[PDB]
Amino acid sequence: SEQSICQARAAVMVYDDANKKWVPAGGSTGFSRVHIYHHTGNNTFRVVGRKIQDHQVVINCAIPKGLKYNQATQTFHQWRDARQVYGLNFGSKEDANVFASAMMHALEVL
Ligand SMILES: CC(=O)N[C@@H](Cc1ccccc1Cl)C(=O)N1CCC[C@]12C=C[C@@H]1CC[C@@H](C(=O)N3CC[C@@H]4C=C[C@H]5C=C[C@@H](C(=O)O)N5C(=O)[C@H]43)N1C2=O
Ligand SMILES: [Br-]
Ligand SMILES: [Br-]
């Protein structure tokens, strides 16, 4: 089965490569509950975020082994895939540190 190993509150953003700016994931700005989930068997992790107001899934992306997770500032962290760059604007330094730590520890289990 699948298990949430950590969660944190963050405004989830994606980078608009064409206009050089960050835009809100899913179309509207606001905080989401962002989880890292582990699936047993094939030992995979994914980031899944749902907007707190309406449960819209704003991010659902795989965490591949060797993913480069960038702590750009104390409360904005980011990573990429082929299609998009994702950014989490955390509610506090503490939320960020919790999430970052779970991510770094996931990358060691992969
Ligand atoms: C090599 C590479 O991919 N580099 C990436 C970052 C990264 C490094 C390691 C691993 C993964 C990633 Cl995504 C990179 O530099 N990127 C990807 C998106 C666009 C950007 C490339 C150039 C620009 C320059 C400034 C920086 C950026 O986007 N920043 C810096 C921190 C700041 C913090 C928050 C967001 C929120 C709104 C916007 C703003 O402040 O107006 N922000 C920014 O402007 C953010 N940029 C980036 O982060
Ligand atoms: Br829970
Ligand atoms: Br496993």
UniProtKB/Swiss-Prot annotation:
Q: What is this protein called?
A: Protein enabled homolog
The species is: Homo sapiens
What information about domains appears in the record's comments?
The EVH2 domain is comprised of 3 regions. Block A is a thymosin-like domain required for G-actin binding. The KLKR motif within this block is essential for the G-actin binding and for actin polymerization. Block B is required for F-actin binding and subcellular location, and Block C for tetramerization.
The record's gene field reads: ENAH
Q: What does this protein do?
A: Ena/VASP proteins are actin-associated proteins involved in a range of processes dependent on cytoskeleton remodeling and cell polarity such as axon guidance and lamellipodial and filopodial dynamics in migrating cells. ENAH induces the formation of F-actin rich outgrowths in fibroblasts. Acts synergistically with BAIAP2-alpha and downstream of NTN1 to promote filipodia formation.
Task: Kindly list the places in or outside the cell where this protein is found, as annotated in its UniProt entry.
Answer: Cytoplasm; Cytoplasm, Cytoskeleton; Cell projection, Lamellipodium; Cell projection, Filopodium
Q: Which family does it belong to?
A: Belongs to the Ena/VASP family.
Please indicate which superkingdom the organism of origin belongs to.
Eukaryota
Give the multimer and partner information: Homotetramer. Interacts with APBB1IP, APBB1, PFN1 and ROBO4. Isoforms, containing the polyproline-rich regions with PPLP motifs, bind the WW domain of APBB1IP. Isoforms, containing the PPSY motif, bind, in vitro, to the WW2 and WW3 domains of NEDD4 and to the WW1 domain of YAP1. Binds the SH3 domain of BAIAP2-alpha but only after the autoinhibitory region of BAIAP2-alpha has been blocked by interaction with CDC42. Interacts, via the EVH1/WH1 domain, with the Pro-rich domains from VCL, ZYX and Listeria monocytogenes actA and with TES (via LIM domains).
Q: What else is known?
A: Required to transform actin polymerization into active movement for the propulsive force of Listeria monocytogenes.
Q: Which residues form the WH1 domain?
A: 1-110
Q: Which tissues is this protein detected in according to the database?
A: Expressed in myoepithelia of parotid, breast, bronchial glands and sweat glands. Expressed in colon-rectum muscolaris mucosae epithelium, pancreas acinar ductal epithelium, endometrium epithelium, prostate fibromuscolar stroma and placenta vascular media. Overexpressed in a majority of breast cancer cell lines and primary breast tumor lesions.
Which segments cross the bilayer?
none
